[PDB]
């Protein structure tokens, strides 16, 4: 295989230098295939809680690399491309959060994991798409401040009956902005297929789906649903993951949807990363000390 030179050298260096390689589900198939662990934000966060290796190569976007570092402040965490980020997250700021606490006095601030680590220092609790409902239901408030994703916030409201105030204005993931007509069309084409979409999708999309959940949840659906065909409303990287796990089923994208940031990592710069042992994720001590609290609290409010 023509990538064997990079694949072989990555595997050698990883072992030689004592790295574990963690990848997100939206990484290119070639990177998923060389990772030690591949999963969603929640699964990655969980894995980061119990991590033994001294050195971590993280393949995803910066806010999750920073979460991994916050949970392992004394381990070396590296990323191939330091610019790999979530633009959604970058629109929420400390000032907006402070504005909204002042405005809504006793509302806890629940932040999605794609949020800056500085914003995490100001959060009461962190969540991901699979635990947001449970976490919000455990809080002793019928109103919460939630960001930066409006769709997940609005989903949480529907599921909890709580009032959810979303910040910032129109915070959303461009990648999950599917149109509901794509479901109408795929119903005609494959009348027996099951449609699975992410909670970051717009309401009309979620409402027409058979299932709504995190990518981690999506991966488990075929364990209990015998459907030959699944239609997947999330980033294209998930198709590879699903088809690997369930070679016996068909996985059809709802639409082609690519996160440019998730695609910044390549075989070539991942190799470079292991050769140079760069770029290290470095955070101020203060930020680690403060942001760890809403992160640990997320796991406390699941189990
Ligand atoms: O794994 C996730 O939480 C996830 C789900 C949908 C979109 N983006 C992400 C991400 O981490 O960027
Ligand atoms: S898929 Fe969406 S939410 Fe996830 S990193 Fe990309 S822009 Fe951010
Ligand atoms: Cl978990
Ligand atoms: Cl997810």
The CATH class of the 1-80+264-284 domain is alpha beta
**Ligand 1 pocket test, candidate residues 44, 64, 113, most atoms within 8 A of CB:** 113
CB 75 within 8 A of CB 55: yes
The CATH 3.40.50.10800 domain(s) of the chain lie at 1-80+264-284, 87-172, 173-256
Rg, Å, the chain Cα set: 19
What tokens does 185 get? Answer: 């069309």
Whole-angstrom distance, CA of residue 39 vs CA of residue 47: 9
Atom of ligand 1 nearest to the CA of 24: 1
- Distance, in Å, from the CA atom of 63 to the CA atom of 90, rounded to the nearest integer, reads 10
Distance of CA 224 to the CA centre of its chain: 23
CA 106 to ligand 1 centroid distance, Å = 28
Residue count of the chain, please give it: 303
Residue of 115, 60, 93 whose CA lies nearest to 295: 115
Distance (Å, whole) CA 132 – CA 220:
18
Spatial strand order of the sheet with 143-147 comes to: 125-127, 109-112, 143-147, 163-166
Rounding to the nearest 10 degrees, give the CA dihedral for residues 190, 262, 130, 149: -100
Q: Identify the CA nearest to 110 among candidates 138, 82, 81, 75.
A: 138
Tell the burial category of 210 from Cβ atoms under 10 Å away from its Cβ (0-12, 13-18, 19+): middle
Binding-site sequence positions for [4Fe-4S] cluster: 86, 173, 259
Are the C-beta atoms of 99 and 145 separated by less than 8 Å? Answer: no
Task: Write the residue with the smallest CA distance to atom 9 of ligand 1.
Answer: 41
Q: At what angle do helices 285-300 and 62-71 cross, to 10 degrees?
A: 90
Q: What count of other Cβ atoms lies within 10 Å of the Cβ of residue 48?
A: 23
| CATH classification code of 173-256 | 3.40.50.10800
Tokens of 195: 């449609």
Angle at 184 between CA 182 and CA 185, to 5 degrees: 65
N- to C-terminal Cα distance for the chain?
44
Which ligand number lies closest to the CA of residue 298? 3
| 20 within 8 A of 282, measured Cβ to Cβ | no
Ligand 1 pocket, residue 86 CB under 6 Å: yes
| Ligand that lies nearest to the alpha carbon of residue 303, given by its number in the listed order | 3
**Fold that domain 87-172 belongs to in CATH:** Rossmann fold (3.40.50)
Q: Detail the residues annotated as belonging to a binding site.
A: 24, 41, 86, 112-114, 129, 173, 198-200, 215, 259
On whether the CB atoms of residues 97 and 10 are closer than 8 A, the answer is no
Token pair 């989903």: residue: 155
What's the 16 CA to ligand 2 centre distance in angstroms? 32
3-state per-residue secondary structure call for the chain: CCCHHHHHHHHHHHHHCCEEEEEECCCCHHHHCCCCEEECHHHHHHHHHCCCCCEEEEECCHHHHHHHHHHCCCCEEECCCCCCCCCCHHHCCHHHHHHHHHHCCCCCEEEECCCCHHHHHCCCEEECCCCHHHHHHHCCCCEEEEECCHHHHHHHHHHHCCEEEECCCCCCCHHHCCCCHHHHHHHHHCCCCEEEECCCCCHHHHHHCCEECCHHHHCCHHHCCCCCEEEEECCCHHHHHHHHHCCCCEEEECCCCCCCCHHHCCHHHHHHHHHHCCCECCCCHHHHHHHHHHHHHHHHCCC
Cis peptide before 279 (omega within 30 of 0): yes
- Quick count: other Cβ atoms within 10 Å of Cβ 184? 11
Contact by Cβ (8 Å): 43, 216: yes
The whole-angstrom separation of Cα 186 and Cα 260 is 25
Tell the residue number behind the tokens 């369930």, with chain if given: 246
Experimental technique, in short, is X-ray
For a ligand 1 pocket test, name from 173, 176, 237, 298 the mutation site with the most ligand atoms within 8 angstroms of its C-beta. Answer: 173
Structure tokens at 49: 């809680």
């Amino acid at each position: 295989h023509h990538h064997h030179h990079m694949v072989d050298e990555i595997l050698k260096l990883k072992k030689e230098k004592g790295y574990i390689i963690l990848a997100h589900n939206f990484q290119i198939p070639e990177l998923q295939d060389i990772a030690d662990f591949v999963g969603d934000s929640l699964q990655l966060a969980r894995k980061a809680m119990e991590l033994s290796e001294k050195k971590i190569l993280f393949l995803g976007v910066d806010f999750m690399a920073e979460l991994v570092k916050i949970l392992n402040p004394d381990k070396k965490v590296i990323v191939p491309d330091r610019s790999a980020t979530c633009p959604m997250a970058n629109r929420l700021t400390p000032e907006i959060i402070r504005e909204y606490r002042e405005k809504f006095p006793d509302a806890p601030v629940v932040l999605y994991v794609n949020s800056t680590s500085e914003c995490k220092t100001l959060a009461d609790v962190i969540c991901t798409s699979a635990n947001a409902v449970e976490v919000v239901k455990k809080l002793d408030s019928s109103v919460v401040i939630f960001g930066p994703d409006r769709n997940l916030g609005e989903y949480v409201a529907e599921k909890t009956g709580k009032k959810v105030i979303t910040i910032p204005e129109n915070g959303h993931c461009p990648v999950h902005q599917f149109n509901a007509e794509s479901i109408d069309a795929v119903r005609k084409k494959y009348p027996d297929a099951k449609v699975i979409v992410h909670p970051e999708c717009p309401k009309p999309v979620r409402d027409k789906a058979d299932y709504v959940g995190s990518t981690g949840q999506m991966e488990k659906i075929p364990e209990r649903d015998p459907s030959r065909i699944f239609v997947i409303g999330t980033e294209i990287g998930m198709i590879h993951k699903l088809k690997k796990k369930f070679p016996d089923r068909e996985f059809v994208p709802l639409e082609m949807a690519v996160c440019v940031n998730m695609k910044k990592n390549t075989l070539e710069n991942t190799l470079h990363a292991l050769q140079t042992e760069s770029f290290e994720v470095i955070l101020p001590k203060e930020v680690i000390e403060k942001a760890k609290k809403p992160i640990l609290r997320m796991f406390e409010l699941m189990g």
